[PDB]
Ligand binder design. Structure first.
Ligand SMILES: CCCCCC/C=C\CCCCCCCCCC(=O)OC[C@@H](O)CO
Length: 105
């Protein structure tokens, strides 16, 4: 029920995470807020996710390939993300990011 969303600052720190993160990955949203999403991407997928983020910032929207997200248990979930920038109202420095996520496995 409802798309699985997150919000981030430009450094990819979570500012919001869907509550269902507990059901899916063990975290509560409180565990992730203020933490950079880069820390939760499997090292094998980090470069590809960065390239997607570069496209996101250039074009304004991007879709990742499948990638591995670090669950609280230490295992990884295969995920995929569509994202957009969102103007902050104060100029370029105020931009933020909104994501919708999909579980691949
Ligand atoms: C380009 C920016 C790319 C930024 C990528 C990095 C940002 C955040 C890391 C991922 C956080 C969410 C993980 C759990 C996702 C669960 C999704 C979920 O449960 O989806 C159900 C759906 O498949 C319908 O069944």
């Amino acid at each position: 029920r409802g798309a699985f969303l997150s919000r981030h600052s430009l450094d990819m720190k979570f500012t919001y995470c869907d509550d269902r993160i507990a059901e899916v990955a063990g975290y509560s949203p409180d565990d992730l807020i203020g933490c950079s999403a880069y820390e939760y991407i499997h090292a094998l997928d980090s470069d590809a996710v960065s390239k997607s983020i570069h496209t996101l910032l250039s074009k304004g929207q991007a879709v990742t390939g499948q990638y591995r997200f670090l669950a609280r248990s230490g295992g990884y979930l295969w995920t995929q993300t569509q994202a957009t920038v969102v103007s902050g109202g104060r100029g370029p420095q105020s931009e933020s990011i909104v994501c919708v996520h999909f579980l691949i496995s």
